[PDB]
Amino acid sequence: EGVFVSNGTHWFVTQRNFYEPQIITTDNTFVSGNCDVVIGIVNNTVYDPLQPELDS
């Protein structure tokens, strides 16, 4: 849901009609295939919450 945006130093996702920056994760994103095809794509981390919990 919503749009990727950057403040220059960082990347966030927000809903479309009211600015509310959230960290980008495997919760608020979905994957579709490898990087090569998409025009205008950029590199960043996308966080994945489960890792530190399996490491508990």
Partner 1 sequence: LQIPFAMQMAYRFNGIGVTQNVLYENQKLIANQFNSAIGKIQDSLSSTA
Ligand X SMILES: *[C@@H]1O[C@H](CO)[C@@H](O[C@@H]2O[C@H](CO)[C@@H](O)[C@H](O)[C@H]2NC(C)=O)[C@H](O)[C@H]1NC(C)=O
Residue ranges in 1-56 that form contacts with partner 1 under rule CB under 8 A: 3, 16, 30, 32-33, 37-40
Task: By CB under 8 A, tell whether 53 contacts a copy of itself.
Answer: yes
Q: Phi/psi at 40 (nearest 5 deg)?
A: 80, 0
From ligand X, a copy of itself, partner 1, none, interface partner of 33 (C-beta below 5 to 8 A by class): partner 1
Which residues lie below 8 Å from residue 49, measured CB to CB, with a gap of 6+? 25, 26, 27
Give me the count of residues in the chain.
56
User: In the bound complex, what is the minimum distance in angstroms from residue 51's beta carbon to a copy of itself?
Assistant: 9
